[PDB]
Amino acid sequence: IVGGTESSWGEWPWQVSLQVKLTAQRHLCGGSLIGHQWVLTAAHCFDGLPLQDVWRIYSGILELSDITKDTPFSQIKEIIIHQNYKVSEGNHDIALIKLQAPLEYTEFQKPISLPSKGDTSTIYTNCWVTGWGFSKEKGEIQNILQKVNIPLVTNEECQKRYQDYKITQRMVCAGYKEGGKDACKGDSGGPLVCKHNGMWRLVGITSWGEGCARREQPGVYTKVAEYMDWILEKTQSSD
Numbered sequence: 314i315v316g317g318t319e320s321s322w323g324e325w326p327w328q329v330s331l332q333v334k335l336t337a338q339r340h341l342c343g344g345s346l347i348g349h350q351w352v353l354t355a356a357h358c359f360d361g362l363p364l365q366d367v368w369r370i371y372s373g374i375l376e377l378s379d380i381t382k383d384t385p386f387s388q389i390k391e392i393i394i395h396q397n398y399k400v401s402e403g404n405h406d407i408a409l410i411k412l413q414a415p416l417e418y419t420e421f422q423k424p425i426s427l428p429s430k431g432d433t434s435t436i437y438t439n440c441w442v443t444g445w446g447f448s449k450e451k452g453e454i455q456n457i458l459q460k461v462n463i464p465l466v467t468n469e470e471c472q473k474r475y476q477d478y479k480i481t482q483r484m485v486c487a488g489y490k491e492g493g494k495d496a497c498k499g500d501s502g503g504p505l506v507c508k509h510n511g512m513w514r515l516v517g518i519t520s521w522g523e524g525c526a527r528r529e530q531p532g533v534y535t536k537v538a539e540y541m542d543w544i545l546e547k548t549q550s551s552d
């Protein structure tokens with residue numbers, strides 16, 4: 314997060330950290346808790362070798378430095394990458410993670426509400442992006458979860474700034490004309506939430522930008538509302 318400030322305990326209880334435990338353990342991506350056993354993140358976080366065995370998912374945490382061998386974590390049971398996602402490309406940058414065990418909700422860890430089907434015409438305001446990613450374009454992972462408020466921009470305007478790519482209706486963009494506030498590397502997969510009718514809603518999944526926080530270069534996010542059919546189908550279960 315570029316241009317943000319430190320979050321407080323329990324402020325963003327759906328924020329998770331996706332880490333890989335190799336010789337050392339490192340935060341790679343964010344994600345959002347959306348159910349007891351389900352996390353929503355970015356597909357491109359998994360572009361490396363297929364090895365869900367090394368991943369550890371941390372919830373209810375504020376500071377990466379607080380993580381030790383004693384910290385509880387979740388493991389991956391299944392990764393569901395969108396069927397039209399292509400490695401290294403931007404379309405359909407969305408993945409579902411099914412956890413091996415369900416999490417119980419507390420004031421420190423609980424789910425973010427998904428967009429409601431009746432809110433297709435909504436123009437979201439008061440949007441926040443959170444994460445432990447870089448605080449500057451050539452920066453480093455941040456210890457305390459950062460937060461920044463960023464306005465949405467129209468897809469027409471976003472497309473204007475990125476005419477080397479196709480900004481589709483399944484993307485949503487956010488940024489300032491003169492930059493200065495943005496998600497960055499290490500924030501990928503985390504939430505873009507906006508308050509609507511006094512409730513937080515997951516509007517975007519942090520995905521990409523050209524550089525970080527540059528003028529007239531908004532952040533590109535996967536538009537969760539445009540994937541609700543897919544989310545519901547992929548998470549469905551009978552009895």
Ligand SMILES: Cc1cc(N)nc(C)c1CNC(=O)c1cnn(Cc2ccc(Cn3cccn3)cc2)c1
Binds near residue numbers: 480520524525532
């Ligand atoms: C680098 C960055 C800067 C920023 N302001 N904020 C974030 C969070 C990041 C981190 N993200 C990535 O390092 C990354 C790598 N791969 N991807 C998938 C992807 C998405 C989009 C395109 C271009 N595109 C636009 C429309 C269609 N395609 C290409 C790759 C993301």
